[PDB]
Paper text:
The [name] 50S large ribosomal subunit is composed of 33 proteins (L-proteins), one 23S and one [name]. The [name] consists of six architectural domains that, stabilized by the L-proteins, define the shape of the 50S subunit with its three protuberances. Here, we present a biochemical and cryo-EM based analysis of the earliest period of 50S assembly, utilizing an in vitro reconstitution system with purified rRNA and L-protein components. Taken together, early 50S assembly occurs in a domain-wise fashion, while late 50S assembly proceeds incrementally.
To differentiate states occurring during late assembly, emerging structural features such as the central protuberance, or helix 68 were added to their names (C-CP, or C-CP-H68). In addition, we noticed that the 5S RNP (ribonucleoprotein particle), consisting of [name], uL5, uL18, and bL25, can dock on a pre-50S particle as soon as the central region of domain II has formed. This can occur both in early (d12-CP, d126-CP) and late assembly (C-CP) and goes along with formation of domain II helices H38 (A-site finger) and H42 (GAC), as well as domain V helices H80-H88, representing additional examples for rRNA induced rRNA stabilization or folding. However, the CP remains mobile and upon rotational movement of the [name] towards the subunit interface, H84 and H38 stabilize each other. However, completion of the CP can also occur after the formation of state C during incremental late assembly.
Residue numbers in the entry:
A (entry chain W): 12 to 81
B (entry chain F): 1 to 177
C (entry chain V): 1 to 94
D (entry chain O): 2 to 117
Amino acid sequence: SEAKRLGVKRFGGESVLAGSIIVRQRGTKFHAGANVGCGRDHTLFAKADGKVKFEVKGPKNRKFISIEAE
Amino acid sequence: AKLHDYYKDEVVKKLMTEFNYNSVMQVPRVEKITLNMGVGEAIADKKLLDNAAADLAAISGQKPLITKARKSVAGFKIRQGYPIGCKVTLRGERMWEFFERLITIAVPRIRDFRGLSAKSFDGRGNYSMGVREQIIFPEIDYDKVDRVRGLDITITTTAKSDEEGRALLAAFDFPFR
Amino acid sequence: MFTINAEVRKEQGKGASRRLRAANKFPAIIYGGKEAPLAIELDHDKVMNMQAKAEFYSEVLTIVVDGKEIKVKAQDVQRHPYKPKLQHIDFVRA
Amino acid sequence: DKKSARIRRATRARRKLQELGATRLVVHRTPRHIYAQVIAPNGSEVLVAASTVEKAIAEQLKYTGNKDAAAAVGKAVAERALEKGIKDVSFDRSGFQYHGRVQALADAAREAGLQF
RNA sequence: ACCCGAUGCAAACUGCGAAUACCGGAGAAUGUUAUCACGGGAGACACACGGCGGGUGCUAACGUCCGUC
RNA sequence: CCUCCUAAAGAGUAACGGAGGAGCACGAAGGUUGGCUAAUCCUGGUCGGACAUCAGGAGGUUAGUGCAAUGGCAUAAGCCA
RNA sequence: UGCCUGGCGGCCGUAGCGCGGUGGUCCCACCUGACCCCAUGCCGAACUCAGAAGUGAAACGCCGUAGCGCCGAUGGUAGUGUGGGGUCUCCCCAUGCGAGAGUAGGGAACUGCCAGGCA
């Protein structure tokens, strides 16, 4: 079977445009933060233009990916 | 709430004397009466369970709730989602009247009455029964009964301990063990 | 009670520990309290000689370095899997 | 329980509306008193607030918690908000059913002049 | 059986977890732009050996093949 | 065609390498609004044998999540209306 | 401004579990009846309508309790990038990066806004 595409495409500190795919995942390893969508395949994309940011939020220590506008 | 005044008059007072409590509500109360009729052998047909539910509704003032199998197992040949048990969910004013009627007339008419089983406690003040021959109630006639069911009343009580549960049972008659 | 004499450490890293082990010594540490812990060297010969008794982990040992005597206690010792050579010792000021 | 149940019920809507970063209006109920306040997107700041506890609203209320009291709280918050210039903030029920004093507050706020 | 203290191990176990490598942002120095795109012309299209991290085998094997130099 | 490693913490990466499944189905098993949240053990009892529905405590997702498996799901993506 | 109570955020166990004490000034909670706004796949169960009649019992605010969870060093080791060496199956050397595991120590939170009561 051909290997699927996983991992993070855009990492922290990277400037991205609207609609840019950040991370491809099967489940939800990371959760959308600010200005980040979530497709049917649990794919995170940036709804605006700005820098990527990774953080931890929530009582269960869940990883969150957000976009900060410049 | 017919028995509510009588309870507040006698039970609260005498429990206060016995337990030197501070506040009025510290005395154990009645949370609910779990009129649950677990036939267990309902696999034969649904009509037996329907008749049990009808009898429960006639005894109470509301339609009973039907409980299905919690999970599917092979040893007990029980599947998942199969309606098996029936219960009555009473929480209001009819509870006092029903309990008064029971403690008045349903207690003496027990075959081979050798005392209620006082050693059945969950561990914090819940008292359960496992008796049979539910024909004690005269509200049901012999012309509408096909077998003998079982009464497994398990009183949900605010008692904080087995000692408090025993004290409340003694307060509500409970002749002996 | 035992007088333990050593040299003040000046190099931090695994190189110093390897050099001491080659030279028949080994590193140790003295901590306990809010004061800055001090890294120290131990001479295998004398330290093993004094530790041959069962009082090493029982009585309060004395480090006399640069003419200064300080009381310490032994908590745990790192022992080599098979080689009979001491590796590292932790000391608590008590 | 009750408080944990209410918090877990409300958190979904609260966070979902927080994703939009929109100023909200929240109402808290209690058989004795009713509270209402406007919350900015940050969550650490408020714009307007009104409660049944204060005499300014309890003077003309026979009982602190009632339908008339809820209506008075709603109209008072709607006023304070329109003088402040909230400009059509959203509303949150804080995990409370929309068939009682919450509905009364919402109706009063909508009818006072707000377009939310 | 249940079952407390764990020992002996796990490529198809990880409540912990590196070093490297890849990714993006800022900066001096340095390199004959050493970087990218288009167009013309290709050649090759059975590689060998050695170092390192590996798979499997009979804890022999140039066994039986991979990623990097 | 899909899942585990293989596969050396980005992606990709071979071997008569070894492990399993599928050719679907659903007009609900989808959308919306609201409500709810398990496996197991113990305590109690007549069929109950040690493990039938039932009352409670611990447990806090080891359940469930249609497909074999992997990763996710409390906001539940699970259940009812 | 000092104490007490409720709501809304940051922080996501130094914020946790168990034990004791304390709380009705205000507020919060227990709960009365419900044909009235409400609805039960049955239930005033949830939610909603009429309190001070009593209380802080259960829940919850605060203080202690280091039994316990958790955070957590310094130091040593493992491990590894570049070069070299050997008995090159594996290990050692100069240099750089070097932590979980165990201890020292910390640990019964803190912070921003609004609202009510006692001062």
